Design a protein around this ligand. Structure first.
Ligand SMILES: O=C1CCC(=O)N(O)CCCCCNC(=O)CCC(=O)N(O)CCCCCN1
Ligand SMILES: O=C1CCC(=O)N(O)CCCCCNC(=O)CCC(=O)N(O)CCCCCN1
Ligand SMILES: [Fe+3]
Length: 274
């Protein structure tokens, strides 16, 4: 059995195997952490299949939702990984031992070392973390050399007609921009977004939450269109000065090592280019 260490946000159901061989991930937040720890994923989520970075490493995995109990059963998992919002752990636990993670209890870096502790891969985890911290601190200097040290960044995501602001730990590049590069945010973003993590926003207050730079995540090119054509949007200094970094949500939603590596290089190149 796994030693099953007690970790904030981690709940074990059943007897976690010490070396899982057939993992079903039902939480795209964590799939790429498992991948990075060279675990064999035999089921993954829609989001994971849509992630152009991660998808390449899980081609053999079946796409499964939590609602596909029969499909999951057929995969013969020895471990199922879920987010704590999953409402039917009860039936999942009847199929295989389940690990449930409550989002945000541990940070984007701790999550990896935590899995290291659970699954006997603290070596592989600690190597990645050390190199990550090195590379990021270097890149931070490079990017701040261009923008200045006090440049403000806002993280933004578009979905359908919805507009969200994000903080430092709700994906969309906020972990890299706000944590790894230690960029400040506009005042209203800090006081209204950072603690909660995200904020649904009226389009017409947007200028008040954007300073020097803005990172905007979206799943396709069309979703922006009409906002990007608006006078209000076009009146925003950061937009006028081409300080808008448009990124692909299908990878930028996540904070796993694989997604992050790509995000890190993408964001660095974008800022240097400005
Ligand atoms: O649990 C839900 C909604 C359940 C649902 O029906 N989904 O579709 C969510 C799928 C998320 C896709 C991966 N994105 C990230 O990990 C980035 C952060 C984020 O945005 N989250 O949602 C983190 C999950 C926990 C936050 C609370 N919200
Ligand atoms: O909206 C949902 C489910 C989808 C979700 O959460 N995803 O991450 C999926 C991809 C983005 C979908 C567009 N929706 C947003 O961007 C909303 C901000 C967000 O994502 N939260 O997690 C805030 C927490 C609570 C929100 C209520 N639950
Ligand atoms: Fe979300």
């Amino acid at each position: 059995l796994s030693p099953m260490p007690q970790i904030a946000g981690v709940t074990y159901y059943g007897d976690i195997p010490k070396q899982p061989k057939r993992v079903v991930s039902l939480a795209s937040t964590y799939t790429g952490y498992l991948k990075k720890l060279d675990m064999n994923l035999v089921g993954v989520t829609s989001y994971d299949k849509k992630n152009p970075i991660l998808a390449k490493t899980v081609k053999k995995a079946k796409q499964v939702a939590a609602t596909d109990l029969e499909a999951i059963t057929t995969l013969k998992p020895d471990l199922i990984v879920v987010g704590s919002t999953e409402e039917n752990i009860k039936q999942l636990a009847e199929i295989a031992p389940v690990i449930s993670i409550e989002y945000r209890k541990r940070d984007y870096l701790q999550v990896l070392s935590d899995f290291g502790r659970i699954f006997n891969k603290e070596g592989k985890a600690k190597k990645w973390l050390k190199d990550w911290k090195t590379k990021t601190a270097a890149y931070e200097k490079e990017v701040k050399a261009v923008t200045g040290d006090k440049a403000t960044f806002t993280i933004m995501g578009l979905y359908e007609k919805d507009v969200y602001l994000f903080g430092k730990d709700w994906g969309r590049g906020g972990e890299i921009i706000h944590q790894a590069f230690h960029y400040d945010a506009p005042e209203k973003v800090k006081t209204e977004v950072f603690k909660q993590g995200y904020l649904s926003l009226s389009q017409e207050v947007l200028p008040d939450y954007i300073g020097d730079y803005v990172v905007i995540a979206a799943e396709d090119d069309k979703t922006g269109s009409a906002l990007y054509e608006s006078k209000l949007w076009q009146s925003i200094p950061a937009v006028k000065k081409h300080h808008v970094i448009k990124v692909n949500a299908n990878v930028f939603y996540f904070t796993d090592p694989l997604s992050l590596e790509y995000q890190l290089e993408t964001l660095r190149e974008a800022i240097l280019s400005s």
